[PDB]
Amino acid sequence: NNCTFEYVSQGNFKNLREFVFKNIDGYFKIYSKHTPI
Amino acid sequence: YQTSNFRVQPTESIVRFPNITNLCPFGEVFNATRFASVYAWNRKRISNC
Ligand SMILES: *[C@@H]1O[C@H](CO)[C@@H](O)[C@H](O)[C@H]1NC(C)=O
Ligand SMILES: *[C@@H]1O[C@H](CO)[C@@H](O)[C@H](O)[C@H]1NC(C)=O
Ligand SMILES: *[C@@H]1O[C@H](CO)[C@@H](O)[C@H](O)[C@H]1NC(C)=O
Secondary structure: OOOOOOOOOOOOOOOEEEOOOEEEOOEEEOOOEEEOO | OOOOOOOOOOOOOOOOOOOOOOOOOHHHHHOOOOOOOOOOOOOOOOOOO
């Protein structure tokens, strides 16, 4: 419908993948980083 | 005795934008083999370039 703005990019719980999202100016900006912890 | 300042500005200033467009193939949209009808006019965006 509307995606003309398409984008393409025991182990001790060894991961931490955080996708914490905040909005500025109303228009959405993804903020993320994958820390292997 | 203080006389004045001097607001120098050699060779004014330089205007700079990033390197040339990326994912703007205007030719295949404008020199296209496939066009549209007038009542069926196509609609495609160009963005981030
Ligand atoms: C795209 O967004 C507009 C804005 O409301 C909406 O009217 C339209 O239905 C959307 N596209 C499609 C194919 O539904
Ligand atoms: C992972 O993130 C990078 C960020 O530069 C992206 O290029 C890539 O497509 C993403 N996905 C994979 C599977 O690498
Ligand atoms: C939606 O967002 C706009 C500006 O971002 C705000 O003015 C409006 O009150 C919001 N509406 C709701 C229902 O949250």
